Symmetry: D3
Subunit: 237 residues, 6 copies
């Protein structure tokens, strides 16, 4: 394809995907052994290595539902990928969610039309795989990292013309605003694979508190430990 | 209210709700001790008793999203109910789902407009509470009952003018078609409570197999054992 | 053979009155009809057949909301040969000039349900009653000396609506009562080639909170039933 | 004055018949009314006032389509005090049992326009006629010996539709005629607190392709006009 | 042979100027063309053909609103061989920097109609003009010394809108004028493989309340006509 | 969070491909005195001169949600007046061929973004007229045949509704890409100007495809046209 210049075999059966290809590089270099770069078309870096002896890939998916939908579809159909774990950032709308909290999207709401296009303009509930979600919760408990599990909201406009929607999201308990989960979940169902999104809170939409671009690139490590350990728990169940 | 003729305290903090009030009567009489009838307005029978010493209520919610939304809302706001477990029936679209299989709706798709009305016409992912879902999966393992966990589809028209939509549901891995879960999940989120739907497959939309009215009323009991045992798991943290 | 109705063909009259509440159906049958038999009780959704002034009449609950009544209406028509359904409901008022216990006739029913969009290529289906059944009801009310208003109902999906401002829009557009069923019954009647009408008694005022008791709703809205039954006789004789 | 009507208050009767075609309005005024004066001609949209059997009546074109007729109907109601509008239209049939020159009465009007969604918070507004006006029309037809059907019209935005399959849906749902205006007139009437009814003569059959000529539509659809005018007299007399 | 146009193939030029108002079409033809003949008068929708500087040109009313103009535009294209339509309309301004009598050129047209959703599987169809026709109009305006703005129109279905707040949105997004047709004409031109452009003169200012008279709209918006006619000659000579 | 540059680092005109490596190629190949001004998330951006005139080029990533972020921030935070997207697209018409250049006077879409801006009505996502004319005139001067008309900005490359391509073809859509309608909505929202010019990299019907290297470094016509169009705009 125009998007992935790898050969079949180059990816593991599980791929962790941040939006930022530079965070994918940092993740692979910091957590994995015997790392090879396996993709670089359009600068969208992907890598394969081992974590505690288990093959794991890590590859950026870019920002937004249309970008990540391409990469996730191709990994599943063209490279045999079974599980995708998005390891993202997100913005908090709830006053009881703080910067650097880790949130797990058992569901993802969205203002995109992509799932309506798949589902005859009805409401498709964009959900994670249950066992992957359980694995992540159990991994977080073993690492002593607090998590909340619930709904994300995958937005199409970061610079939204309707900020009042944040109040609606908050009323409905949305844990974090990001731009991808509902898309990845729709692709996973469409093409018969499994996915989960875990995010670290990088911005507070109410308070204005934020992290730097450097922090987002190299500093959200709890979520990656949880993600990797969750894979091992899923293998051994 | 016009729908419930009970006093606060008459209901437990957890209520199991089938659509059929006669199934509610059967559940209470068969599984609970010291049962009392606490509601009978419009014939929508509700009961309260104990299960292994633990206070539990069971009450009908009627058919369809508009019916069950009324009862779920009132139990939460007027009677202090913290958890609702819908114990329903459903129609299968998948070739690997059989009559009497028990399915757990971690999400519920829908063709209703009710969540759009709540959510500014965007896609609200109607999801169960994660811990209640985990409790149900764990209770099923302990009871030796096979389950599948994933998406239900809550339909507004049992007699649908669009049977092709079943093919779409199948392609997206929908485990069962019922008429309520998405509405119950929307209410639970709106009013700050927790819910889960567990259903027994009563019809197969592809094979044409159907159970009788009597079977639906009194024979789908694995789901009830799972529901009740899941409550006890939830209490024990 | 259906999961919803445990009757045999023949058990229902060609005209069925339908309240949402099966206990109201029981009260209607026992109060207004002779030689009554119970003909359905699956899911507690009581139905009955008797005679009114010698004419066969059935009365059966349809439950709350469009998805509930759609199932029962469809089955009565296709499986039991029912020609006419008259919903005999309650409703909540939004207009200042509509009062508790007024009787309102839904020539049309607006809705916030998606069911008619599903039937009609996502366009606007005008959910309307049968014209002659509507005329029969107006004439029967006139003959009884009971005032009625004839116009639009609004069939809501959420009794506990997250958008109460919509009641203002309903009032501005002259909606006579809010209930939860008419637009669904009208869509089923058109889909399956039968006739329907919804008549409702105002049981609540949505602006003021004025309310009737559960017992009042179940046994006490009699004018609408006399109007419904007499309207059937007018229709037979026309 | 508005850009659309160059008449003075008082120039219109409290009842206005409205065909889409200003030349049919001219025909109606010349053929059925006495003491006629022309009261509007802006944009060629001819309107007239005279008397029928002594009763003041106006007749004015509304143009083709919902956006055109919405402008005229609103202004007549709010600026000229009009109480009742009877659209006297043509329509295209989709049913086999509906034939050229049949008269149909639109107790409701479905639509593929977005205008009533704009008025009604994107829900389904059931665009309905006034009940008494409808009854008056049905009764007048009976007195004139003209067979009518009473039911749903479908008010299309696109005469040359990109979705002819929709006609099959219309036919299933018993749609009596396809025109382009009623649902818009009924929305305006409700919005601004007046009463309206649409009566149409079948001028095309969508299935057989048979079409009446322009001249036949302009000056030959007498039954619907006789029905409309007599229906007004019925409405006056309770 | 259509119900809407009583003309023969060849009666129309390959280019037709279309205002909404048939009386403006008459004024345009009589004022600007030589050897004029009337070629349509069905429904009072006057159409004419003559020459401009020796070049055959037609001018015909399209009526108010998308459904009206969609019928005439389609038939001109498919039945009379028309290749270009230039709508020469009026519009209402929402911007503070747009004044009465300004000429605006609609390289695009937004809309609240459902017609393009019906053509385009309920997605967003960008209703655009033909580029070269747009260029020709800009260049003709420069040659005629007439200031123009080129950008988006908004084609409304409800002149009497229940949502005046939308004007604030239009203004934010730079909408140059509110009219009722352009999006519909552009949708038909794309559907049937022809070319269109809408040029409008500001007749009302929605914020200041300034309004031109019916007479002004009919006969005084002539800069846009000079631009339209000269733009055709440029298009021929490219 | 997305751009690590100071005010003044971008020219008033920015060319934007989706591919940051194509941005690098454009800067290296067509501009002088180039410096890299952004690299956050790998989304490379550069500023240099074309025939003496200051010009920037920066990737926008794939899809409406990605490019809407970059375009917004360039306008509001970096004072950018004109954005010219220099993209690829897939053809659906039989008379549109690989390597053909197409100019999006308008962009249709299946995204909800403009509905969210425009009270759920139809916003006609259009280019700036003069930028469009400049590009057409520049193409004529370069002797490059262009078609000018509607693009279609898709949200799903791997669409579940391939029948829609038939509808696009009927309606004359020149190319399918994933960005224009979003960039045009942002430009209107924040009061700037934009145009999309694309090279056909795929034929959606025939299956003809250019390689990834071809997309990255061989679509020169559209770049020459974009840069020359800027000079025409300066001088008109
Ligand atoms: O405030 C926000 N709104 C929407 N998404 C995010 C995210 C998550 N990301 C990061 C990135 C946009 O900065 C896109 O991939 C989605 C962090 N903060 C926010
Ligand atoms: O085939 C089906 N379609 C939709 N729902 C159900 C259900 C679940 N219920 C049972 C009941 C309708 O029979 C309503 O409460 C939803 C079982 N089978 C089906
Ligand atoms: O305030 C109201 N909102 C909606 N419906 C009703 C009705 C009519 N019914 C009664 C019942 C809900 O109480 C449902 O079947 C529709 C009475 N009051 C109201
Ligand atoms: O075949 C049809 N389709 C839609 N409308 C009409 C009508 C009614 N009119 C007549 C006119 C278009 O001819 C417009 O005002 C609506 C007659 N025939 C048809
Ligand atoms: O304020 C306005 N709103 C909508 N359209 C127009 C127009 C343009 N026309 C004129 C005519 C309505 O007066 C219809 O054909 C559209 C001028 N002013 C306005
Ligand atoms: O076949 C296609 N469908 C949708 N977009 C494109 C494009 C244009 N791009 C390239 C890139 C996806 O390959 C995204 O930025 C939009 C080229 N070919 C196609």
């Amino acid at each position: 394809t125009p998007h992935i210049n790898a050969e079949m075999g180059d990816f593991a059966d599980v791929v962790l995907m941040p939006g930022d290809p530079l965070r994918a590089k940092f993740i692979a270099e910091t957590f994995l052994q015997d790392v090879r770069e396996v993709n670089n078309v359009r600068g969208m870096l992907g890598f394969t290595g081992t974590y505690k002896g288990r093959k794991i890939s890590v590859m950026g998916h870019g920002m937004g539902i249309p970008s990540c939908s391409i990469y996730a579809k191709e990994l599943i159909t063209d490279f045999g990928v079974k599980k995708i774990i998005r390891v993202g950032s997100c913005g908090a709308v709830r006053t009881d969610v703080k910067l650097r909290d880790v949130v797990i999207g058992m569901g993802a709401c969205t203002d995109s039309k992509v799932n309506r296009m798949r589902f005859k303009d009805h409401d498709y509930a964009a959900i994670a795989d249950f066992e992957m979600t359980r694995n992540a919760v159990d991994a977080a408990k073993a690492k002593g990292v607090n998590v909340r599990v619930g709904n994300l909201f995958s937005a199409d406009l970061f610079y939204t013309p309707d900020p009042q929607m944040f109040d609606v999201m908050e009323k409905y308990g949305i844990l974090g605003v990001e731009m991808e989960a509902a898309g990845i979940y729709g692709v996973a169902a469409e093409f018969g694979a499994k996915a989960l999104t875990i995010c670290t809170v990088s911005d507070h939409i109410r308070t204005g508190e934020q992290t730097t671009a450097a922090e987002r690139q190299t500093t959200f490590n709890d979520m990656i430990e949880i993600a990797l350990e969750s894979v091992l728990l899923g293998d051994n169940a």
